[PDB]
């Protein structure tokens, strides 16, 4: 969007595209570090990387579970976190594209918005699946409940990264003009601002009202109990009956089948002659030692 703006000589398009792109770059690096380090902590305490055989981690390590909840809600672009602001500026740049005078830009304007809505909804689904089959429900391996809490500095690093993610989320209106010092010109959303602090205040204070109402409308309410198993229509519950990532991602395989079959088609792996060699994997790492040793020394 920024390159199209500098092609069309539209400074608002350049400003919106560049800061949206670079803000989303910084925010993505933050919450991706959150996600990778937390998944590594889960592997560190358990030993498994397959989410089919990784359930019930939210009760074993709750600090890590909260940190991955923040990271998943930050990556799937949800307000007021840091993955939503950059997508908002990118959508503003898309709307500036949709009003510029060009047939190649007006045709491409709303289509990018439609497909970015596709991508956001698919990301929301993917992180719903990831949090559901990993940090929620009963564990599906004996190796899972044996996992104790995360270490000290691992938890410190992941919580500090999540704190930075939340800070970059709510303080977007104070950090976006800081990035306006690099791409240097006025930011011109189309007559609209979004304000992450009021969404932040309106997402902690609004759920207090049903809490107050249930605190008022309760009479002889017994304390809430979490004792039994899930209701599976009279028969007892088994490990083969829970729905996991295999069964949760079936209608996307149902509706988006042509793209997933296009994955198999455009795969020119058999056309390379020396790809199936015995020692091709070791040969590549053998010349890798040669190449790094000869290119470092010529710089020094």
């Amino acid at each position: 969007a920024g390159v199209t703006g500098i092609a069309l000589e539209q400074p608002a398009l350049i400003a919106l595209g560049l800061v949206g792109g670079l803000y989303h770059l910084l925010n993505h690096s933050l919450f991706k570090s959150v996600l990778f380090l937390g998944a590594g902590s889960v592997w560190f305490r358990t030993g498994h990387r397959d989410i089919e055989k990784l359930g019930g981690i939210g009760k074993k390590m709750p600090v890590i579970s909260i940190a991955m909840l923040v990271g998943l809600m930050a990556m799937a672009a949800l307000p007021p976190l840091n993955g939503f602001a950059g997508e908002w500026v990118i959508y503003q740049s898309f709307f500036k594209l949709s009003n510029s005078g060009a047939f190649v830009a007006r045709l491409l304007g709303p289509l990018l918005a439609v497909g970015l809505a596709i991508t956001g909804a698919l990301a929301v689904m993917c992180m719903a699946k990831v949090y559901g089959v990993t940090f929620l429900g009963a564990p599906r391996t004996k190796e899972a409940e044996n996992a104790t809490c995360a270490p000290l500095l691992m938890s410190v690093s992941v919580v500090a990264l999540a704190i930075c993610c939340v800070i970059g989320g709510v303080a977007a209106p104070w950090l976006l003009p800081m990035l306006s010092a690099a791409v240097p010109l006025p930011l011109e959303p189309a007559n609209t601002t979004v304000s992450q602090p009021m969404i932040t205040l309106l997402l902690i204070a609004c759920p207090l009202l049903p809490f107050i109402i249930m605190a008022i409308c309760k009479g002889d309410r017994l304390p809430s109990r979490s004792r039994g198993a899930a209701w599976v229509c009279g028969y007892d519950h088994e490990k083969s009956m829970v729905i996991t990532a295999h069964g949760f991602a079936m209608p996307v395989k149902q509706a988006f089948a042509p793209v997933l079959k296009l994955r198999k088609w455009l795969n020119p792996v058999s056309l390379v002659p020396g790809w199936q060699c015995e020692g091709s994997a070791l040969l590549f790492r053998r010349m890798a030692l040669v190449e790094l040793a000869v290119l470092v020394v010529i710089i020094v």
Binding site: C233, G234, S240, I243, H246, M250, P251, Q254
Partner: protein, 532 residues
């Protein structure tokens, strides 16, 4: 005498195997064959002679002849008669050769005899427990006459279910979708395991007999002859008159009992009136999964006026009590009979308009075709009998082959379709509503008259026969042996859907999750009739 030709064919195919043969009635025949030569005889009469394996069951005759008795009832339908194949299983080593590797319809009767009597069919592949619950102690065989008292209750071994479900086409990655035993709109306990990959059903196993009361043992211990007619009515609320007529005709065929003329065909009137009640309930449930609900409540309305003639011909709702061994209890009078005639006609008025729903044909063309297809090849092997086998192409009907309550004086029409879909089985039941309404139109205007009851007769001991009725879901075959003037030695009942159940694996295969309750209800199961 009916059945001479089949006996001659069995004698020429097997020279010295028929140890004894006798006739129960003119159309009823039994043969005693050798134990080690049993599977060849029943397979011959099944495949070569075109016989259908109706019911097979054990017996406890250790104080009559010192041997167990396993019967094999076959229905000759190529004139048409009943052939029962009887074997004498040894007492201290109960083992007889199995039929399931040869006839697939012998898969649950030979699983029931493993549980009720403890007899061991050698070579049976499906050895899992069928009727007894999972907490039942092993060697207590209930239907053995000396294993336990009817009133004894063993301690449950386990609280959790220990049943094993097989996955023929799936693997260890497939998920399961329960549909029982406590499911809404099922209204009756029965577990199902849809081994699904997405919404598609790869395989389907099920656990049944959650409603196994154990009334086979109670009918021979605490209960007499006229009182089992109350037991047959309280099996299920919709086949009540089917079980009672099937049991009554088993005891009247066991003796002579020349029943009076109108007491036969009034049972034929009430047998068809009940299938107005049961088919229009299934057609209402057919619209509650196809989609429309204003097609269901309206089938509930035409079901109510079917319940209105059942209110006036008897005076009861659901479980009744109108048949005795000699004849019928309560008797119909003139205006009731003139009246039922045009309320039969106005239903044919109403039924025609409501059937204009499939003429509408939107969810009745995409949801109900290609869904739950029952192979006529498979239906012939497993001997299904209801609208399942009539949709699949076989004109199997008891009222045409074996007229039992004077159906020969009534206009009989057998309707068989060619497609095997859900919509094909609805078309069987739609044409059966008009057919039953023709009998009510032609039955109640030409009653022969005479008496109603024949009582005072003495029950000859150790006399048995087969009783049969055309239930709305197929036939129920009742085999009862008289014990004395008061009690029964043995009463065996097979439900209409008992033969129908072992083919649900081959319907639910290849279909979806969403229409799976429609496939189950397409054949209109009566769990309480089959669970006994």
């Amino acid at each position: 005498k009916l059945g001479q030709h089949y006996l001659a064919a069995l004698n020429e195919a097997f020279p010295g195997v028929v140890l004894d043969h006798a006739w129960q009635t003119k159309d009823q025949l039994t043969v005693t064959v050798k134990v080690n030569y049993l599977p060849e005889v029943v397979e011959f009469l099944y495949y070569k002679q075109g016989g259908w394996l109706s019911v097979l069951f054990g017996n406890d005759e250790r104080k009559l002849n010192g041997h167990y008795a396993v019967y094999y009832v076959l229905s000759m339908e190529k004139t048409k008669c009943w052939i029962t194949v009887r074997v004498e299983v040894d007492a201290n080593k109960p083992e007889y050769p199995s039929v399931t590797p040869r006839v697939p319809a012998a898969v649950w009767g030979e699983r029931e005899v493993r549980d009720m009597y403890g007899l061991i069919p050698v070579g049976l592949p499906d050895e899992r427990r069928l009727v007894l619950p999972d907490d039942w102690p092993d060697e207590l065989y209930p239907l053995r006459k000396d294993s336990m008292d009817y009133r004894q209750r063993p301690a449950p071994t386990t609280d959790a279910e220990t049943y094993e479900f097989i996955n023929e086409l799936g693997d260890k990655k497939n998920n399961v979708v329960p549909i029982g035993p406590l499911h809404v709109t099922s209204d009756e306990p029965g577990h199902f395991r849809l081994f699904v990959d997405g919404e598609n059903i790869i395989d389907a196993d099920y656990r049944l007999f959650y409603v196994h009361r154990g009334m086979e043992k109670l009918a021979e211990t605490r209960m007499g002859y006229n009182e089992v007619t109350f037991l047959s009515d309280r099996v299920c609320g919709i086949c009540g008159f089917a079980h009672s007529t099937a049991y009554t005709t088993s005891v009247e065929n066991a003796m002579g009992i020349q029943v009076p003329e109108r007491a036969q065909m009034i049972r034929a009137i009430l047998l068809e009136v009940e299938r107005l009640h049961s088919h229009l309930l299934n057609l209402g449930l057919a619209c509650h999964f196809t989609g429309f609900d204003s097609g269901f409540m309206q089938f509930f309305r035409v079901r109510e006026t079917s319940m209105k003639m059942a209110e006036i011909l008897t005076g009861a709702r659901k479980t009744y009590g109108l048949n005795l061994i000699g004849g019928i209890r309560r008797d119909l009078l003139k205006d009731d009979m003139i009246q039922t005639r045009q309320l039969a006609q106005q239903m044919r008025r109403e039924v025609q308009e409501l059937v204009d729903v499939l003429l509408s044909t939107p969810n009745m063309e995409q949801r109900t075709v290609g869904i739950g297809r029952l192979d006529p090849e498979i239906a012939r092997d497993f001997s299904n009998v209801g609208p399942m086998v009539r949709a699949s192409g076989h004109a199997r009907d008891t009222r045409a082959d074996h007229p039992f309550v004077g159906y020969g004086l009534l206009p009989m029409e057998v309707h068989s379709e060619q497609g095997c879909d859900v919509i094909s089985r609805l078309k069987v039941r739609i044409n059966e509503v008009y057919t039953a309404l023709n009998m009510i139109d032609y039955g109640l205007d030409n009653l022969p008259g005479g008496p109603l009851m024949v009582e005072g007769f003495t029950y000859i001991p150790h006399r048995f026969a087969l009783g049969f009725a055309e239930a709305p879901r197929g036939d129920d075959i009742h085999w009862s042996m008289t014990g004395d003037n008061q009690k029964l030695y043995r009463w065996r009942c097979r439900a209409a859907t008992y033969a129908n159940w072992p083919t649900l694996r081959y319907m639910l295969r290849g279909n979806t999750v969403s229409d799976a309750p429609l496939i189950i209800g397409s054949l209109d199961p009566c769990y309480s009739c089959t669970d006994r």
